Ligand SMILES: N#Cc1ccccc1C(=O)Oc1c(Br)cc(Br)cc1CNC(=O)c1ccccc1[N+](=O)[O-]
């Protein structure tokens with residue numbers, strides 16, 4: 001985990017974070033961080049390899065207002081898994097479908113809350129044949145991820161703010 | 163699913179018992195969970211849970227050890243754990259803090275900073291009984307991934323119990 005601190009620049013930090021996630025078994029990740037008292041997700045510090053077109057679509061369609069993981073992050077420090085049960089509203093169903101169209105169907109979002117009031121998320125997606133399989137993979141690496149997200153927050157906020 | 167009993171708990175007594183049991187199973191026989199609401203700086207009226215000896219908690223406050231305890235300034239700046247380690251260029255007060263902590267049975271341990279979703283500031287401090295630093299670090303490192311999960315479950319349920 002200590003390799004995140006020693007990185008030079010955003011590209012290398014991103015490369016390290018992506019490979020950590022990739023080696024762990026998650027093909028796609030997004031790391032997003034906002035300063036205290038901001039809700040302008042559009043203009044967050046963002047790192048990762050989500051498809052560019054999806055990132056653009058998410059911003060355009062105002063999905064930050066709809067995405068169930070966003071509101072979850074404002075209320076909690078606990079992970080939220082991308083299960084059918086989290087897409088409760090008709091608009092969130094639309095969100096699920098569009099995210100699925102980008103290849104992002106299985107995964108989880110770890111809320112980030114920094115020492116300086118930074119608000120963020122580390123979202124990770126896993127390629128799987130089905131839900132049950134994806135859930136077992138995620139369970140099998142969850143403690144490692146749980147440490148990872150805080151190491152990423154601490155180093156990530158360092159990169160973005162100091 | 164073991165972590166779920168922290169939310170199911172009704173009242174501080176019940177919650178404290180569950181948290182202590184979970185921590186004790188992991189080899190931490192003494193714990194203190196401390197939490198302050200958003201923008202509050204006064205460590206006295208903090209929501210404090212655990213089984214640190216009462217006399218030690220009283221003395222820590224009385225002697226003003228919070229300004230000498232390295233974990234305090236660490237917690238305001240980081241979300242990463244800090245292992246208890248004296249500075250070894252230390253002031254009489256810093257020496258006394260560790261000496262009196264040690265006398266209270268709290269020589270080895272770590273503090274997990276707590277930063278809640280609603281701006282809560284706190285710490286989960288846990289002590290392990292050990293003969294030396296090598297043994298202690300072994301004991302703590304071996305449960306660190308589980309503890310990492312526990313501190314966030316404790317933070318989330320504790321904040322609700324305390325403020326919500
Ligand atoms: N900064 C910050 C931030 C702070 C709090 C919560 C969240 C975020 C965040 O990054 O949110 C985004 C953004 Br800004 C763009 C995208 Br694109 C995706 C997410 C978060 N959501 C997901 O990654 C997600 C969650 C569930 C299903 C599918 C996705 N997804 O594919 O985007």
Ligand SMILES: N#Cc1ccccc1C(=O)Oc1c(Br)cc(Br)cc1CNC(=O)c1ccccc1[N+](=O)[O-]
Pocket residue numbers: 194195196197198205208209214218219222231233234237238246263268273283284285287288
């Ligand atoms: N709330 C909050 C809080 C918020 C941020 C940081 C810290 C705390 C905290 O609880 O700090 C205390 C207090 Br209030 C009393 C006691 Br008693 C002990 C600690 C934290 N420190 C330790 O537990 C500790 C750390 C290093 C060596 C020895 C000890 N110790 O035995 O107390």
